[PDB]
Design an enzyme around this catalytic site. Structure first.
Site, PDB file in Angstrom:
ATOM      1  N   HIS A  61      36.396  42.896  47.577  1.00 37.98           N
ATOM      2  CA  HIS A  61      36.852  43.243  46.205  1.00 37.98           C
ATOM      3  C   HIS A  61      35.787  43.104  45.133  1.00 37.98           C
ATOM      4  CE1 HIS A  61      40.780  43.048  48.179  1.00 37.98           C
ATOM      5  NE2 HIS A  61      40.532  41.791  48.565  1.00 37.98           N
ATOM      6  N   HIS A  91      32.246  35.714  39.526  1.00 36.44           N
ATOM      7  CA  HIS A  91      32.199  37.057  40.037  1.00 36.44           C
ATOM      8  C   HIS A  91      32.222  38.044  38.887  1.00 36.44           C
ATOM      9  CE1 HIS A  91      36.445  36.206  39.451  1.00 36.44           C
ATOM     10  NE2 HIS A  91      36.486  37.499  39.027  1.00 36.44           N
ATOM     11  N   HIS A  93      33.378  42.252  37.506  1.00 39.90           N
ATOM     12  CA  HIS A  93      34.129  43.501  37.669  1.00 39.90           C
ATOM     13  C   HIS A  93      33.238  44.539  36.980  1.00 39.90           C
ATOM     14  CE1 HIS A  93      37.798  41.271  38.621  1.00 39.90           C
ATOM     15  NE2 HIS A  93      37.256  40.394  37.825  1.00 39.90           N
ATOM     16  N   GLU A 103      37.465  44.285  32.224  1.00 34.15           N
ATOM     17  CA  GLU A 103      38.866  44.082  32.345  1.00 34.15           C
ATOM     18  C   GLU A 103      39.512  43.884  30.977  1.00 34.15           C
ATOM     19  OE1 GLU A 103      39.573  41.264  35.605  1.00 34.15           O
ATOM     20  OE2 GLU A 103      39.877  43.102  36.726  1.00 34.15           O
ATOM     21  N   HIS A 116      33.325  36.733  35.179  1.00 36.86           N
ATOM     22  CA  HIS A 116      34.305  35.684  35.173  1.00 36.86           C
ATOM     23  C   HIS A 116      33.758  34.450  35.854  1.00 36.86           C
ATOM     24  CE1 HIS A 116      37.708  38.877  34.863  1.00 36.86           C
ATOM     25  NE2 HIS A 116      37.103  38.645  33.732  1.00 36.86           N
ATOM     26  N   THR A 195      43.387  38.033  37.551  1.00 37.55           N
ATOM     27  CA  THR A 195      43.440  39.504  37.400  1.00 37.55           C
ATOM     28  C   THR A 195      43.432  40.218  38.768  1.00 37.55           C
ATOM     29  OG1 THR A 195      41.098  39.985  37.197  1.00 37.55           O
ATOM     30  CG2 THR A 195      42.348  39.405  35.182  1.00 37.55           C
ATOM     31  N   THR A 196      43.455  39.477  39.858  1.00 33.24           N
ATOM     32  CA  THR A 196      43.600  39.984  41.204  1.00 33.24           C
ATOM     33  C   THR A 196      44.865  39.304  41.800  1.00 33.24           C
ATOM     34  OG1 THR A 196      42.071  38.297  41.963  1.00 33.24           O
ATOM     35  CG2 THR A 196      41.216  40.549  41.701  1.00 33.24           C
TER      36      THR A 196
HETATM   37 ZN   LIG Z   1      37.712  38.366  37.699  1.00 28.98          ZN
END
Ligand SMILES: [Zn+2]
Length: 257
Positions: A61, A91, A93, A103, A116, A195-196
């Protein structure tokens, strides 16, 4: 089986994870004119001098840089937080193009990417217990814009060839996450979620106002990662972001006037 593909992306998550339609979901659009300056908010304390990075992993992901969180080395405190939160991983995005990737959004502006840094509340003892609590996690979010290179990101970029596919990891010791911070620690805060999936409602979000600059080459190298495993049809790891979710009965607070 959730992902960011054509048939398993964010708009499908609610079927396996009904909390996706809940009251405290993340991310959100930050409407800067409706966020309230809260003079009771403290400056954030980011204490990363003793941080111990261990490993970087492509989890299918995103990639996660993992830290030793068995002692108070790298902690977040202050701001809107009570108590002490330990860094577990960071991590990012990102998008397929520079005009999307973040995000959170700011007055509907999308940034190229978002970092994040995930931290868990020490009063719960472990990350897995913390995610079951409404004050379990503190996630520091930092926007990335494309311009000048970020020198302190380059060590991350240079290892990505070695973790191209899902399930690959590499040793990643001695990385200093202070090198990913912007100059200013002004922030917005609100109560939200991971958010996942499983999208647990356990996060105090702290979203920095000042983006960091990265180069076009640096983000291009993120986009050469793969969502798939080795030997499977290549699927570039791009657009691994959840769009903004309804704010509902929540207040965004600003640390600055
Ligand atoms: Zn995140």
């Amino acid at each position: 089986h959730w992902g960011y593909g054509g048939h398993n992306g964010p708009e499908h998550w609610h079927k396996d994870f009904p909390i996706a339609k809940g009251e405290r979901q993340s991310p959100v659009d930050i409407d800067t004119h409706t966020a309230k300056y809260d003079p009771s908010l403290k400056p954030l304390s980011v204490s990363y001098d003793q941080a111990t990075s261990l490993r970087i992993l492509n989890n299918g992901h995103a990639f996660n840089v993992e830290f030793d969180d068995s002692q108070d080395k790298a902690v977040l405190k202050g701001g809107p937080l009570d108590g002490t939160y330990r860094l577990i991983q960071f991590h990012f995005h990102w998008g397929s193009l520079d005009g999307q990737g973040s995000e959170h959004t700011v007055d509907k502006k999308k940034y190229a990417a978002e970092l994040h840094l995930v931290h868990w509340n020490t009063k719960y003892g472990d990350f897995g217990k913390a995610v079951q609590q409404p004050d379990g996690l503190a996630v520091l979010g930092i926007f990335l814009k494309v311009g000048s290179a970020k020198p302190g990101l380059q060590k991350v970029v240079d290892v990505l060839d070695s973790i191209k596919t899902k399930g690959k990891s590499a040793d990643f010791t001695n990385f200093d996450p202070r090198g990913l911070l912007p100059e200013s620690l002004d922030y917005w805060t609100y109560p939200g979620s991971l958010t996942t999936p499983p999208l647990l409602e356990c996060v105090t979000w702290i979203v920095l106002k000042e983006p960091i600059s990265v180069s076009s080459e640096q983000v291009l190298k993120f986009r050469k990662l793969n969502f798939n495993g080795e030997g499977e049809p290549e699927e570039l790891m791009v657009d691994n972001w959840r769009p903004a979710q309804p704010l509902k009965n929540r207040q965004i607070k600003a640390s600055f006037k």
